[PDB]
Design a binder for this molecule. Structure first.
Ligand code: CA
Ligand code: HG
Ligand code: HG
Length: 279
């Protein structure tokens, strides 16, 4: 299948060069897989989700996304127009408040929740979790991420947006999960993207168009935005039967576009997520 005039990030992940505009993908489109989006919530009624999204847990007074961030990131995972895996099922877990902030204790709870909840869902092709969030280093937050991964969920996390070594950030610095940096249209590392040896892979993160709250759309930048491109790609590859939850991050790095990115500091991987599609 081909989506013509797609968002640049979608085109980039199905191409071996920058500057294309068509997103090529297998029609299976991640059907039978599930992606938990752990964020500010999801506006599940947005038409772009086609009834494939639902809120399963909140840690605040409401389950509604009053922020937009979570809705945007879900959209990059699996909205019709803006999504990598256009037929995946999306589950929203609200660990962040409507200002975009949350305590580590509640972020940890949300992770432990997903590890258990996936046991009562029908997700034949596997289960992914997308965490476009993070803060300063915390061994407890790293440990919760590691548990979620070991439970059999493909965990993809943001590297952080400080233009710094991601070793000092939590979400990011846990080696066992998939830590994602951000790149821009021209194949440069995004100016804000964290880097370092703990990064596994880069995805598109600058000027990413997707769904927003109030049934709208919006372009936003941040290494947060790259995360869902890799989460969606994992779900897509898992439904194809190419890889499993446990080995997805490695499989993605193995099959990545290698050496394309500029402004990568020595000691950081130069690998850009790539679907390897062939008609
Ligand atoms: Ca890793
Ligand atoms: Hg987000
Ligand atoms: Hg986003």
């Amino acid at each position: 299948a081909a989506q013509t005039n797609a968002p640049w990030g979608l085109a980039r992940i199905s191409s071996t060069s920058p500057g294309t505009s068509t997103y090529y993908y297998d029609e299976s489109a991640g059907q039978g897989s599930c992606v938990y989006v752990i964020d500010t919530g999801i506006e599940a009624s947005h038409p772009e989700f086609e009834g494939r999204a639902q809120m399963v847990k909140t840690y605040y007074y409401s389950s509604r996304d009053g922020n937009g961030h979570g809705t945007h990131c879900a959209g990059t995972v699996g909205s019709r127009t803006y999504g990598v895996v256009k037929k995946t099922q999306l589950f929203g877990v609200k660990v962040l408040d409507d200002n975009g902030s949350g305590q580590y204790s509640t972020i940890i709870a949300g992770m432990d929740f997903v590890a258990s909840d996936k046991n009562n869902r029908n997700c034949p092709k596997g289960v992914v979790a997308s965490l476009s969030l993070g803060g300063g280093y915390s061994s407890s937050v790293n440990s919760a991420a590691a548990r979620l991964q070991s439970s059999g969920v493909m965990v993809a996390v943001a590297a952080g947006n400080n233009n710094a070594d991601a070793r000092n950030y939590s979400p990011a610095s846990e080696p066992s999960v998939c830590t994602v940096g951000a790149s821009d249209r021209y194949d440069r590392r995004s100016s804000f993207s964290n880097y370092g040896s703990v990064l596994d892979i880069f995805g598109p993160g600058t000027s990413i168009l997707s769904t927003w709250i109030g049934g709208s759309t919006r372009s936003i930048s941040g290494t947060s935005m790259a995360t869902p491109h890799v989460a969606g790609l994992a779900a897509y590859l898992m439904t194809l039967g190419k890889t499993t939850a446990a080995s997805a991050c490695r499989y993605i790095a193995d099959t990545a576009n290698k050496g394309d990115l500029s402004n990568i500091p020595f000691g950081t991987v130069n690998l850009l997520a790539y679907n390897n599609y062939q008609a």
